[PDB]
Scaffold this active site. Sequence first.
Site, short mmCIF file in Angstrom:
data_model
loop_
_atom_site.label_atom_id
_atom_site.label_comp_id
_atom_site.label_asym_id
_atom_site.label_seq_id
_atom_site.Cartn_x
_atom_site.Cartn_y
_atom_site.Cartn_z
N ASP A 12 43.71 41.88 38.51
CA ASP A 12 42.77 42.57 37.63
C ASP A 12 42.05 43.71 38.35
OD1 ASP A 12 41.04 43.35 35.74
OD2 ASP A 12 40.11 41.37 35.48
N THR A 13 42.58 44.95 38.13
CA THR A 13 41.95 46.10 38.79
C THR A 13 40.56 46.40 38.25
OG1 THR A 13 43.05 47.60 37.24
CG2 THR A 13 44.19 47.07 39.33
N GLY A 14 40.22 45.86 37.07
CA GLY A 14 38.90 46.08 36.47
C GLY A 14 37.88 45.03 36.87
C1 LIG Z 1 38.22 37.36 32.16
C2 LIG Z 1 38.97 37.99 31.01
C3 LIG Z 1 40.10 38.85 31.58
C4 LIG Z 1 39.55 39.93 32.53
C5 LIG Z 1 38.62 40.97 31.92
C6 LIG Z 1 38.25 42.05 32.92
N1 LIG Z 1 37.52 43.18 32.36
C7 LIG Z 1 36.57 43.85 33.26
C8 LIG Z 1 35.87 44.99 32.53
C9 LIG Z 1 34.79 45.70 33.35
C10 LIG Z 1 33.37 45.14 33.18
C11 LIG Z 1 32.87 45.35 31.77
C12 LIG Z 1 35.63 42.76 33.84
O1 LIG Z 1 35.14 41.94 33.05
N2 LIG Z 1 35.22 42.90 35.08
C13 LIG Z 1 34.18 42.08 35.68
C14 LIG Z 1 34.80 40.83 36.26
C15 LIG Z 1 33.83 39.91 37.00
C16 LIG Z 1 33.63 40.30 38.44
N3 LIG Z 1 32.54 39.87 39.04
O2 LIG Z 1 34.50 40.92 39.04
C17 LIG Z 1 33.39 42.84 36.71
O3 LIG Z 1 33.94 43.60 37.49
N4 LIG Z 1 32.07 42.64 36.73
C18 LIG Z 1 31.17 43.29 37.65
C19 LIG Z 1 30.18 44.07 36.79
C20 LIG Z 1 30.85 45.08 35.97
C21 LIG Z 1 31.44 45.93 37.02
N5 LIG Z 1 32.55 46.73 36.55
C22 LIG Z 1 32.40 47.98 36.16
N6 LIG Z 1 31.19 48.55 36.16
N7 LIG Z 1 33.44 48.65 35.80
C23 LIG Z 1 30.40 42.23 38.36
N8 LIG Z 1 30.11 42.39 39.66
O4 LIG Z 1 29.86 41.37 37.67
N9 LIG Z 1 39.27 41.57 30.73
C24 LIG Z 1 38.61 41.75 29.61
O5 LIG Z 1 37.41 41.54 29.63
C25 LIG Z 1 39.32 42.05 28.29
N10 LIG Z 1 39.78 40.82 27.66
C26 LIG Z 1 41.08 40.60 27.41
O6 LIG Z 1 41.96 41.41 27.75
C27 LIG Z 1 41.47 39.29 26.69
N11 LIG Z 1 40.32 38.40 26.45
C28 LIG Z 1 40.26 37.19 26.98
C29 LIG Z 1 39.02 36.41 26.68
O7 LIG Z 1 41.11 36.88 27.83
C30 LIG Z 1 42.14 39.67 25.37
C31 LIG Z 1 42.74 38.42 24.61
O8 LIG Z 1 41.19 40.32 24.52
C32 LIG Z 1 38.39 42.89 27.36
C33 LIG Z 1 38.07 44.25 28.04
C34 LIG Z 1 38.97 43.11 25.95
C35 LIG Z 1 40.32 43.90 25.90
#
Ligand SMILES: CCCC[C@@H](CN[C@@H](CCCC)C(=O)N[C@@H](CCC(N)=O)C(=O)N[C@@H](CCCNC(N)=[NH2+])C(N)=O)NC(=O)[C@@H](NC(=O)[C@@H](NC(C)=O)[C@@H](C)O)[C@@H](C)CC
Lengths: 99, 99
Positions: free
Chosen positions: A25-27
């Site tokens: 997960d690059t995101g």
């Molecule tokens: C767990 C579910 C799969 C992974 C997740 C990763 N998405 C990123 C999006 C960027 C933030 C909004 C993420 O949540 N990243 C978090 C993961 C937790 C983590 N700690 O790494 C993150 O980096 N969070 C940072 C804060 C946001 C930072 N990111 C940023 N600013 N870009 C953190 N430290 O808390 N994917 C998703 O959230 C997507 N979900 C999905 O693809 C599927 N949904 C389900 C529930 O699987 C599909 C059936 O809809 C969303 C976007 C809908 C298409």
Amino acid sequence: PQITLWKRPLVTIRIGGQLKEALLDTGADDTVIEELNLPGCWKPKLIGGXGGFIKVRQYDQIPVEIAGHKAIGTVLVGPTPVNIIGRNLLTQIGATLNF
Amino acid sequence: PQITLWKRPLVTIRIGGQLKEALLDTGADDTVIEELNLPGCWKPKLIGGXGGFIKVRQYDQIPVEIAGHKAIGTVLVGPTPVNIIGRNLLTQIGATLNF
Ligand SMILES: CCCC[C@@H](CN[C@@H](CCCC)C(=O)N[C@@H](CCC(N)=O)C(=O)N[C@@H](CCCNC(N)=[NH2+])C(N)=O)NC(=O)[C@@H](NC(=O)[C@@H](NC(C)=O)[C@@H](C)O)[C@@H](C)CC
């Protein structure tokens, strides 16, 4: 390997001595695995996605083998919907995006 | 281009006439954009991450240029904290993961 994205990039990982499936997960900044026990001490943390925030257990310096490539780093454990390998370990195995 | 993962993989996109920054997210099935007006038909959808679900507006056949590469597909518009490019568009620009 080269992994295309027509399907979810799910791979097998080894962690704490057992096999799991996780999404590359690059995101994700961090690696987040469903509830389980890991050896050592952990500290409470909050992380966000998107739909809001969840509480997780942060474990440091955990060995994780990802598709046969070794990493040692932070693993967050908690009620994530999907096991995810985030950039903190993707950088250790030399993963890049290419197009 | 090659994008490493030491920092979040943020790139410039063009959608609906507008230039924005978005995160390339191999862990996203779909593409989710901050608010934004856009067109003349949509369907309601809920999408989840993490934290829980959010309500979005599904628009189809929206052109999206990503780092200069043209794509066209479904875009979900809603109160996401970050614009997210998911696999539905990443495949169209021939993006792969490599390690
Ligand atoms: C767990 C579910 C799969 C992974 C997740 C990763 N998405 C990123 C999006 C960027 C933030 C909004 C993420 O949540 N990243 C978090 C993961 C937790 C983590 N700690 O790494 C993150 O980096 N969070 C940072 C804060 C946001 C930072 N990111 C940023 N600013 N870009 C953190 N430290 O808390 N994917 C998703 O959230 C997507 N979900 C999905 O693809 C599927 N949904 C389900 C529930 O699987 C599909 C059936 O809809 C969303 C976007 C809908 C298409």
